[PDB]
Write a protein that binds this ligand. Sequence first.
Ligand code: V3J
Length: 291
Amino acid sequence: DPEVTLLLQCPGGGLPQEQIQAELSPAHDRRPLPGGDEAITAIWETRLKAQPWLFDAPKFRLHSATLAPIGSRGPQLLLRLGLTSYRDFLGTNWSSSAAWLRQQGATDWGDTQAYLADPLGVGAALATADDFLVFLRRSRQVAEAPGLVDVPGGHPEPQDLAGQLVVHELFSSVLQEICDEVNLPLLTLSQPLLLGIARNETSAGRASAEFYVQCSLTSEQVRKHYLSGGPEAHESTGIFFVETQNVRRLPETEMWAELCPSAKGAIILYNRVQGSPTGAALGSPALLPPL
Ligand SMILES: O=C(c1ccc2snnc2c1)N1CCOCC1
């Protein structure tokens, strides 16, 4: 799967909010382009002169994420974050020249991402009370990954002593994206666990935080809530469900070729961190079938 790379696999079945620190610093921002940020401005101007209803928005930038030694007490993860924007994304990661910016970053800074916006996404492996994961079909008319399968999520917009508010907004935003797109009540959702971070190599290495969220409703009830919004209540064109039993072998199915890279990230991390039992009971051959 060359279109997805794992940057972080979380320990202990995934990390709760209270075990994560963030450092939000201009030291973690994109570097100005070698010939100046005028190239980003020119692309934006061309875009607005064709689609003048478009608007810019701020985004978090992932610089890096450092895990503590396993088995330790105290904070278990440090997220190094800067700030970027939708405009900077359109002029760098989404640019036809994105691979040239990666080579220049290697040359100038020893960092393939130095000249990339790299806005941080969020996504969820969302499980039902009857043990299914939730999938969404993307419109065939959108610019990114048309007609492919996705999981719930988005790209959160800003607003340890400003850090804890930032971690709070990241955990909040994955629940908000589930309530807005799937139309579920907030009180049917668990507190999220962070499974890990996955990079989209088809979009020049931009990264998504991937979470595990449990719903107290069954697959049939989740479908009812999704549909009862009507076609205007969601960006996706349909919802469907796969037994957690069958998610284990999903990369061997015809569905895999239809998953967008960030949804592949969410399913690989679910299989590694929530699947793959470590103990004698769940590891027994009748509960963990060979092959
Ligand atoms: O939701 C998104 C979107 C896509 C990529 C990124 S990367 N940073 N934030 C993003 C936001 N879009 C694009 C514009 O039209 C509506 C759908």
